[PDB]
Amino acid sequence: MEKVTKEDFETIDTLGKGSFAYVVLVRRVGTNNLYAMKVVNKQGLLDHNRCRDVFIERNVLSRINHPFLLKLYWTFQSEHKLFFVMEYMAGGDLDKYMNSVPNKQLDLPTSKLYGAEILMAILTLHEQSVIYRDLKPENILLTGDGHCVLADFGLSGSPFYVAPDVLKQREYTNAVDFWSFGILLYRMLCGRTPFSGKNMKEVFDNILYSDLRFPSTVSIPSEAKDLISRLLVKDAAHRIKGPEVKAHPFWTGINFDEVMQKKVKPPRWVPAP
Amino acid sequence: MEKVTKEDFETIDTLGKGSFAYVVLVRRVGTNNLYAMKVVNKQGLLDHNRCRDVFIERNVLSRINHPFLLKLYWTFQSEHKLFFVMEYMAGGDLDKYMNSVPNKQLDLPTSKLYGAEILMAILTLHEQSVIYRDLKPENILLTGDGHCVLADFGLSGSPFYVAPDVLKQREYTNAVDFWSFGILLYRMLCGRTPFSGKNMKEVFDNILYSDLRFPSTVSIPSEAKDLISRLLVKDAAHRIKGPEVKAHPFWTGINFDEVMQKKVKPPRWVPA
């Protein structure tokens, strides 16, 4: 790619702020092309021990160009900052989309496709020893044609998706992602998360101690219940792991190769540029 | 893919009409998804040419996944017809696009990107032993975000892109695709094809015997002129081949790995 510097991008708007990074909507000078540019303080990266994360993002994930991870176009530096010019997703996120559909529920074909796309993303991250840690609808972005893409993992509701492991020990492993994935699958199919409460204390107690229950009013295939139940085993040591999740009978009727090729479209996508 | 038949697609409009096949815009019933479906009357398979083309589409091209080859979702048959459900390209084709831009000329960055994407498609076809043989702007479709995609399952302008190899022998090698590629690069940069005439006989005589001539009113890099000239060598044996085309200095400002990942966007794309 061209040897760009910060001078080659015109800031149009702000897309968010963080501890030591911010994201701006930019237009590449001389073109009509828009991008989401993440600007990260170099000293901040060093103080937060994020150099490995940056190396993986820039030198490993960028080569994979996974369809359901955010696309990276350019990385470059200034004196004090590193810049990551990434795809601008104006189609919103999955939290907003699900809150706008009737009953808050996605039908089975859509839930299964989005579950497969998200699973492929999570499996790719784990292969690179990256734990997403914050899987939730707000961090799943939608393309213009209705496919799911994981939000920038460096950047990042949450109380409902936290695993027992994190509440008890703050210990992050691949299993916490599969717990959150089970919460997400349940949410897409049922219209709500499985564990709630009148305050955070009750929510955490239910996450730790309450048996999983499915709504009597929602028709869920037995295979989906089986997979969600195994993803939401309380003890991480006995939780279903990646290979068994990918081989689970719930994925009957969806071909992961065709999903990776974008040949399985969302049946009811509502484009809205 | 889920099993389908003709009954699962509702015709919205007609996109193209051909001798023994037509393309329609369709919607998968029960969804909001749109596709382009080519319908081929099996009666037209008596022609060895049309029979071979459909054979290649059903058995070879159907198995290729490439960003710049048109995507095929389903292929199936009825008692007397054949069906190809492919991606509907919202941007239309490169012939209409180039006839809309001022002076009918694409700028150098756009010409180089589109040339790179088309070259990647051609090289992949040759690796699969497929000769496209009909490379021209009408067969280059445009995605909603401005990328070029070779039409693979469409209906069979054309006289301006035919190589001397075809005119002399009626015989085809990989070289005919690189001749058409030469004509296309010249068209994008210069606003017209190199060889024209007042009738078809004049056009063919110029292709066979007239030395390539570049316009005096259009300035193009010497590297672009060199590559087009190597592509438009009339003797097939001495025409530039695939690997030398890919390594040519004209592609200096392009990285083909990034183009394959759709990380090089067209700078002026007008999604209308």
Ligand SMILES: [Cl-]
């Ligand atoms: Cl511009």
Ligand SMILES: [Cl-]
């Ligand atoms: Cl390290």
Ligand SMILES: [Cl-]
């Ligand atoms: Cl510094």
Ligand SMILES: [Cl-]
């Ligand atoms: Cl970061």
Ligand SMILES: [Cl-]
């Ligand atoms: Cl794509």
Ligand SMILES: [Cl-]
């Ligand atoms: Cl069939």
Ligand SMILES: [Cl-]
């Ligand atoms: Cl052949």
Ligand SMILES: [Cl-]
């Ligand atoms: Cl050859």
Ligand SMILES: [Cl-]
């Ligand atoms: Cl060759």
Ligand SMILES: [Cl-]
């Ligand atoms: Cl390559």
